[PDB]
Design a protein around this nucleic acid. Sequence first.
RNA 1: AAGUGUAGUAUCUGUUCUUAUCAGUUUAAUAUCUGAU
RNA 2: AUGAUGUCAUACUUAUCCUGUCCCUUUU
Lengths: 95, 100, 79, 108, 111, 75, 316, 260, 78, 183, 33, 219
Amino acid sequence: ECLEKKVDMSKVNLEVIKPWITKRVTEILGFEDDVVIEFIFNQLEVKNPDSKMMQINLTGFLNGKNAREFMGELWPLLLSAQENIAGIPSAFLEL
Amino acid sequence: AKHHPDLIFCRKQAGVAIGRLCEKCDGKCVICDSYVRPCTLVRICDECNYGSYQGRCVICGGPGVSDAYYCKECTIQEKDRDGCPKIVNLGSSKTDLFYE
Amino acid sequence: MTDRYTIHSQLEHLQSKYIGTGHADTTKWEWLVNQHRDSYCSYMGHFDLLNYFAIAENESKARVRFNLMEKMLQPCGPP
Amino acid sequence: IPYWLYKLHGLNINYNCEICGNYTYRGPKAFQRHFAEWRHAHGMRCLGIPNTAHFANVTQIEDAVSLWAKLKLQKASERWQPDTEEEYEDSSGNVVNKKTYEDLKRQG
Amino acid sequence: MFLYNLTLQRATGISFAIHGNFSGTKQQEIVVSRGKILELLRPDPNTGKVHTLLTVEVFGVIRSLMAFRLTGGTKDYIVVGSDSGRIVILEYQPSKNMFEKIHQETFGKSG
Amino acid sequence: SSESNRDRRERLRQLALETIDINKDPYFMKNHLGSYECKLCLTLHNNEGSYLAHTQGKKHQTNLARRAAKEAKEA
Amino acid sequence: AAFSVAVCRFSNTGEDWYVLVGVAKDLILNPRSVAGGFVYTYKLVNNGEKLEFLHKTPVEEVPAAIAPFQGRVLIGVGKLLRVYDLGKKKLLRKCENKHIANYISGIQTIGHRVIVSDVQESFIWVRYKRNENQLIIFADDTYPRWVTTASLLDYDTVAGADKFGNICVVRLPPNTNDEVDNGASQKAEVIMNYHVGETVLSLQKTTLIPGGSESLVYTTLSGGIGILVPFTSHEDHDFFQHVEMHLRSEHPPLCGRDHLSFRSYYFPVKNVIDGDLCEQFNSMEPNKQKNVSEELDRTPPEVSKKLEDIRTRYAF
Amino acid sequence: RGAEYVSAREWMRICFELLELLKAHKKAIRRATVNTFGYIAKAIGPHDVLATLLNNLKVQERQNRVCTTVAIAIVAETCSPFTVLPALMNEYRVPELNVQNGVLKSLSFLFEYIGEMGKDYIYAVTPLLEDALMDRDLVHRQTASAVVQHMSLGVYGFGCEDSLNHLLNYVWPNVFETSPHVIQAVMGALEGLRVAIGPCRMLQYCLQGLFHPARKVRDVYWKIYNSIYIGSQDALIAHYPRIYNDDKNTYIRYELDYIL
Amino acid sequence: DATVYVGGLDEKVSEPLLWELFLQAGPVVNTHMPKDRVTGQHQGYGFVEFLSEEDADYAIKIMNMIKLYGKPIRVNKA
Amino acid sequence: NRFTVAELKQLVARPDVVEMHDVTAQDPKLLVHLKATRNSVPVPRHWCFKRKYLQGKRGIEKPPFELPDFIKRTGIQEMREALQEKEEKIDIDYQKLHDAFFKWQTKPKLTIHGDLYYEGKEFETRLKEKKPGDLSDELRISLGMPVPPPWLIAMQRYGPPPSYPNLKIPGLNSPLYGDVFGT
Amino acid sequence: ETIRRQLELEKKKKQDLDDEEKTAKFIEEQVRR
Amino acid sequence: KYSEPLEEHGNFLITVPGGSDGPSGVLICSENYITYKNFGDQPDIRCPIPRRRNDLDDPERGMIFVCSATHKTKSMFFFLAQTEQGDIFKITLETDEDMVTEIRLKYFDTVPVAAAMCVLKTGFLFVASEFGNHYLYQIAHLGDDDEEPEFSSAMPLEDTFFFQPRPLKNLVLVDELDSLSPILFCQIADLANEDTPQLYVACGRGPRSSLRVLRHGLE
RNA sequence: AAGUGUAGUAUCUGUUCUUAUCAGUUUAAUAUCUGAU
RNA sequence: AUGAUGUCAUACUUAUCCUGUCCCUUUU
């Protein structure tokens, strides 16, 4: 899976991924919830997080298909941001 | 235990605390479950005695009076050097006895 | 990551936490690796055993210690 | 009709014994008895396959010969035949077989 | 054949070594750890001769030897790591010339 | 109670032995562990009742009739 | 690379005490070496002060032993026991035995039998019928031991060290079928077992201080020479046993190890009284001395005299 | 304390009265009864006390029934076991399964209480234990395993290797069993044998079972191996035999073959 | 030919004693002395199937002279 | 997938200890290497049985207990029988019991390390080596011969025995001793 | 009962002491040689 | 707290004393290398192990620190480290204002195969070998004020600094603790003409060979 | 004509598979079980 | 002629066990 590659949340911002994750949760979860957003934000707090535990938590909160969608949306964006020399993906520069 | 096979020993790391056994279970071996030939003293876990958990009985779980010791059969068999033998579980014994 | 493999614990079973406790499905490579590791640790432990093992070669005690600590990783072979 | 006994005791289990004269056996214990029986004994005797442990539960007639050959003194039956005492050299030559030793003792 | 063990000459090889003021005085002592016996030496500063001040059979496999000196002290302890799972912290007793067990704590199994 | 229990057990054993003698049963045999065994039924019995109760089920007398006819071909 | 040496006379030869020295070429500590073996035949003449390797019979595997037996040279070629005879060119292999398990680590030549100690297997007593010229394994051992050295205790007793730091003594029973024609048939019992503490590699117990009883002097790889001597009295054995049982609880070690565990590390203890722990009675405290004297029903100087008596009778 | 003002007939009557005190619903009462029986045995003598105890018909198997065996062991520890041994061996000749199991439990408790004193009774207790090892009843095998455990724990270092091997010869087939009590007793006896008989013989007896094909056989053998490896972690080096080296694996510890 | 019968013996004879007696002459492969289960006594007759016909004939010819329980123990082919 | 039993026997070094259930194992090579150990003890015969290893002694009428001579010569059994007869005291001796338990103590017949207890293990009265000329004293006693056997003369008339070519008879070939009558 | 063995034990101890004295005298005579 | 990989596997560690005396850090020895990588933002300073100039040893055979001791003084602190060839080198930790400046090594002396080293007060160095008699030398020279060069971590090389070994110039052997170690063989017999049997015991390791004819007495 | 409760084991009584095959799970292998003729 | 099945009785073992508490729930 795309979440099998080692990542590092220390080498990337967090405000750039906050509203994107919030919109993804509002679309998948439908309603407006603060526990899910705060849980997703605190999940990426460590310097060397793990994608497996994040996927398990997303499957617990989401249905499991939306969990796969959220994992496959958050993993590559974070990887591209960590790969960027400035530390952000291509969407942060578009607007 | 031989009397309570459904019991779960703590198996925690050993500390610097000396434990005691309930007066009803005075002299009973903590591991061997015998009544004679003690060799070594019983060491309690660090978390096994903190306030309300302090002064409780190892096997009986009640208020302790006398200081317990490991059975010589358990000491010679390299059994006394194990983890914290605190009875964390309480089931299949003294459950419905209060109802009677 | 659709794997569905959450191997943590089920009902507080036996679950041998000791290193080298042994099991039922232990393959020959596993037993051989455990035995080699235990033998290397024992050779590192006994002082007289270390002297008798290193007295064969002209190497020093530290030479035998380094050669033993280096052979801990993959002594038998990649299974 | 103790079909319970037939299934539990191991009956109704087909087995073919080429060592036991290409015979049939209706059970696993029956198979062990047919591999080691008077019929299979006479079969191995007429076939030249003597009785043994590793040559007991064999079925194929081909592997029995290989077992009898490999077991036919794998490494044994060699006491010593360097004894010759070739005194022609007496300082660096003394190598001759025991058959050559007897030949020298008989002829010269 | 009921035999009786008799050690005529102790082990002279040194497996572990520590140096410090374990005697509690200005003199500096050397704690040597053989295979199955510990020794404390106080060699002559002027004469330059090494005398075996004390020699005691540990009755075990001494695997590690590290010294200890508490804050504000003038006498060093002796940490004795053995094959058993008992961590021992001993202290010298020159008044009696015997190694006193100051503390002993079990950690695990044997071997 | 306890001694009364031992007396009752002894009386029960006596009654069972009397019944076995009156019936002239060969199967009932006293075991080396203080139990009864039916060689005809080829079964065990913990108490005397289980040994005397080997006459309702497992009528092996029909299976013994086979050996009776094998020992003598004539009826 | 040399591995073993010895000196003995040949039966076919006269008083020419030949020095047989075995060595191996292209050897290695890793498990992938053998190449070849050579047994240089030293002459050792000129009033025992002039060696001369005349013959140079090549070996098969890695030679590690050479001894005399009925005038012939019993040598160990790996897992083979070769009884050779000193010829003109090389030692003519007058007899061969292929019953060895792993490798000939030690060979003790008895008057008629031979004790072969393997590297991974324990000792094995093999009888060499000279009329038929055939060696046959007479029996084996129950528990294995990495034997590093060996000593012939008696006509049926054999003592052997262990690479893991053990010293054992196996005594053959009276019912040993010396005449022959799980692994083997005949088995022997372990009559002595005691943890030496250090890896012993030499044992030739004989007679130390002249006028004393013979004993087994054992060496150690850590620089220690001890002496094992027997208890010539059942009362003395009981006294020593009571003393040990009291000292096990009165003056225990400082390292926290138990005497039963310190003595039974590799294999259990079997009729061995640890006199080293017994010597602490002289250094024991006064209260400990009084407790020991009370438990033993004797005086502390009585125990001191009893301990000194053994050291005076069996040692220097 | 006193043991003097009590007459011989008075002591016998007190024992006959205390025999009825064992039927209580408490444990401390039973412990005190055992201690008092032991004191009375030390005062009057072994013969009468052992005779009064031997009459235990054991109406109930519970309610401190084995307590008679515990009292026999206490009397043997207070009195000369040379007197208590053959009387118990003779009482074991009775037919009742209750009496036989009681004799076995009493022998186990007596060996456990004696400990070092059993250096002489090993050869004498061997054949009875070997005969009772024949699994005629599960309780008999359980008592056998318990006696073996107590003897192995008590004979440590006393030199009872022959009796240990003779007992293991009959204790080894008990490994295959489904009884929880029997399984626990067999495991405890295996632990005691590894303690006394040594881990070398234990591994030599449990070697073939490790790589067995079956599920249940492999499970039992793996439990035995895990028990033998929990302790003796250092001595498992030598007992590990030399397994030949495969193609992609070099398992043979060549360093052990280093001939100095 | 390999099988043989041997009679003329009393209750003193039994299976292992008869086997050890036969082995003195030739190796008794499979011996059988059917004892009547009713009375529990030796019938004084047994059947021995040897390893082959050679040892069978040898024991029938030469070994047919021993006497178990005092009476003569003959041997006959079977 | 699964190796053949014949193949495992041909590849094995000691195939005399091969079993039929070993072909479907997980590591048959390891099992063969382990079974051919020196002091290796095997698994018992209960691997395939179905009687729970204790349901065999159904009808065997066994005795109560065969006490030893150390206890039998002490007189405890007779005293116990007397007490049972009187009920259904003696004070015989104590130093006698002391000497019996200490002095008159007999070392019984133990077993080897590999003595695994089989199911019956009762009807297996084996013999080490009953060579020609070595038997029990009961045979010579029933024969009533004084202190060679009568059968050694028959080998002179009929010839040497076929099954025992290595036999050496007394008087003629081997120049007898005691009950032993062969070599 | 134990008193009997105690008396016998003391007698055996005296006998062993006399034997050890004789052995010491013999060893001394040998050392003198 | 912290995790830091290394270039190659190590063999031994030595704690550089910190606080008021010296800086904090741990010098790790590895095969042909010694690396000082303290905590914080301090960088890794490397120094290869020297070798004997024109040494007959095998080139493939590396070098590892057999043992090391530290002479902690109120003024400064130095370390004495024994190599596999027994050449005792003197490591000096060149320290900056708050970080490690460089590792200054110098050939202190030539010692035997050292199993342990203890630098006691009063200028004494107890060097116990894995085989043979012990050693107790007198520390005379402080490692400086001599013609021997000081190889520093800042001194580049590409190539190892060849060592010029010499006899004991900075140490004097005061005594020798016999301690007959590896007794390969033994023969207790009256090899001499006397009655008191002698114990001919061979012990040593190659050049340290010694056939000690032990005799029960006092010299 | 008196025992209370907590866990587990065995021996007793009553019933059932002449189903010919194929594939799979499972078994050491059988067996049992699951689908088709 | 061993066995599997499981309502319903029976013997046994665990030195099984009778004053055990709300000393801790004080959420609105």
